[PDB]
C-alpha cells in the first residue's frame, strides 16, 4: 500500500535534501520524521511531491481551494505533510489529524538588539520590520490592525509599519529573503518562531537572535482527503508518540 504525499517546503519542517534532473528526490525534516514514524508503525510506504503553487491553501473566488489543501480536495494526493495550520475553514474540505506541533509567532533580529518581544518591536521604529506578503503573519496583523473591535495598539502600530508604501517597503516575497535582509541590513523578520529558532541556531556566522511567544488553540496537523479511512489511526499514533515521549525526541533532533 503506497500513499501519495503532497508537501510544502518550510525549514526545518520539510526540506529538500537531494535534487535529480531538476526535481527533489529525498526530503527531510521534523514533519518528514513524523511521517516516517507513521509509515513504519502503521505499515505503509509513500512518495512525496511538492504542491505546484508552493502554497498551503486558502479559499478562492469560485469556492475552489489552491495549494496543498487543493491537492487533497481534487484527490491528487492522499495525505498532506507540512506545517499546515488547523482551521475550521480547512476542516470543511479536508480531514485533519490531531495537532502535532504548536503554532508560534516570533521575530528574527540581528545579533545585538534590545528587542525582547513582538510587543517591544511594535513600540520602536528604528528597526523596520515585516514578513512575507499575503502570508499568515501578514494577514493576521492586517486583520487585527484594521478591526474596529480590536483595541490592542500593538497590531495597529505593526500594521502601520508593515503596510508602509502599501507593503512594498518592509515586506518580502519569500522567507529566505526576509532572513537575508536581517543578516545584511537593518531589519527584523516576523515569522513562525520554530522556523526562526532553527535558522538562528544554524547560521554559520551566528548573526541572529530570536524571540517569540507560542499561541494556544493553534497548531499544525497532518491533512487527509475528506472521509479518509486513515485519519483516526493517524491521530491515535500521534497521541502515542506524544505520551511515549517520542515526539519530544523528534523536536530535540531539530530544535536542540
Ligand X SMILES: O=C(O)c1cc(=O)c2ccc(Cl)cc2[nH]1
Query: Which residues of this chain interact with Cl ion, rule CB under 5 A?
Result: 45-46
From 8, 6, 60, 12, select the one nearest 200 (Cα to Cα).
Answer: 12
Query: Which of these, 128, 121, 130, lies nearest to 173 by C-alpha position?
Result: 130
Cα dist from 22 to 12, 19, 226, 242, whole Å:
21, 6, 32, 37
Task: Enumerate residues 6+ apart whose C-beta is below 8 A from 185.
Answer: none
Q: Which of residues 167-196 bind ligand X (CB under 6 A)?
A: 172, 177, 180-181, 184-185, 190, 192, 195
CA angle 211–30–188, rounded 5-degree value: 25
Please identify, among the stretches 28-36, 91-99, 136-144, 236-244, the one whose residues bind ligand X according to the rule CB under 6 A. Answer: 136-144
| Near ligand X in 217-256, by CB under 6 A | none
Give the nearer residue to ligand X in terms of CB position, either 13 or 65: 13
Q: Residue 186's binding partner, choosing from Cl ion, ligand X, none, with beta-carbon cut-off 5 to 8 A by kind?
A: none
Phi and psi for 166 in degrees, rounded to 5? Answer: 60, 25
Q: Give the binding range for ligand X (CB under 6 A) out of 81-89, 200-208, 231-239, 242-250.
A: 81-89
Please state the closest distance from residue 132 (CB atom) to Cl ion, in A. 31
Q: 189 has which bridge partners?
A: 108, 130
User: What minimum distance in Å lies between the beta carbon of 27 and ligand X?
Assistant: 15
In the complex, minimum distance from the CB of residue 20 to ligand X, in angstroms, rounded to a whole number: 26
Residue of 96, 91, 92, 93 lying closest to 81 (CA atoms): 96
- The 95-124 contact track toward ligand X, x by CB under 6 A, reads ----------x------------x------
Closer residue to ligand X, CB minimum distance, 234 or 254? 254
By a kind-dependent CB cut-off of 5 to 8 A, residue 38 interacts, out of Cl ion, ligand X, none, with: none
Q: Which residues ranging from 44 to 63 are in contact with ligand X (CB under 6 A)?
A: 56
Residue 136 in the binding site for ligand X (CB under 6 A): yes
Given ligand X, Cl ion, none, residue 239, with its beta carbon under 5 to 8 Å by kind, binds: none
Residue 142 lies near ligand X (rule: CB under 6 A): no
Q: Distance (Å, rounded) from C-alpha 10 to C-alpha 253?
A: 16
Residues near ligand X (CB under 6 A) = 10, 13, 56, 83-85, 105, 118, 135-137, 140-141, 158, 172, 177, 180-181, 184-185, 190, 192, 195, 213, 215
Amino acid at each position: 500500500v503506497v500513499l501519495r504525499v503532497v508537501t510544502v517546503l518550510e525549514e526545518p519542517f520539510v526540506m529538500v535534501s537531494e535534487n535529480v534532473l531538476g526535481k527533489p528526490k529525498k526530503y527531510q525534516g521534523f514533519s518528514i520524521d513524523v511521517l516516517d514514524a507513521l509509515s513504519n508503525y502503521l505499515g505503509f510506504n509513500y512518495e512525496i511531491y511538492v504542491a505546484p503553487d508552493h502554497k498551503y491553501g486558502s479559499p478562492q473566488e469560485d469556492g475552489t481551494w489552491n495549494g496543498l489543501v487543493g491537492e487533497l480536495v481534487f484527490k491528487r494526493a492522499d495525505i498532506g505533510i507540512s506545517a499546515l495550520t488547523i482551521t475550521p475553514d480547512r476542516e470543511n474540505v479536508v480531514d485533519f489529524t490531531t495537532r502535532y506541533m504548536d503554532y508560534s509567532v516570533g521575530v528574527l533580529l540581528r545579533r545585538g538588539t534590545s528587542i525582547q518581544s513582538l510587543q517591544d518591536l511594535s513600540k520602536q521604529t528604528d528597526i523596520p520590520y515585516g514578513t512575507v506578503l499575503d502570508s499568515a503573519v501578514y494577514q493576521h496583523v492586517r486583520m487585527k490592525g484594521l478591526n474596529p473591535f480590536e483595541r490592542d495598539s500593538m497590531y495597529s502600530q505593526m500594521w502601520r509599519m508593515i503596510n508602509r508604501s502599501n507593503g512594498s517597503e518592509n515586506n518580502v516575497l519569500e522567507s529566505q529573503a526576509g532572513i537575508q535582509k536581517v543578516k545584511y541590513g537593518n531589519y527584523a523578520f516576523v515569522w513562525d518562531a520554530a522556523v526562526l529558532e532553527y535558522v538562528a541556531i544554524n547560521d554559520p556566522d551566528c548573526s541572529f537572535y530570536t524571540v517569540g511567544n507560542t499561541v494556544a488553540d493553534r497548531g499544525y496537523g497532518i491533512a487527509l482527503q475528506h472521509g479518509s479511512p486513515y485519519r483516526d489511526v493517524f491521530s491515535q499514533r500521534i497521541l502515542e508518540l506524544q505520551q511515549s515521549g517520542d515526539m519530544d525526541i523528534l523536536k530535540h533532533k531539530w530544535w536542540p
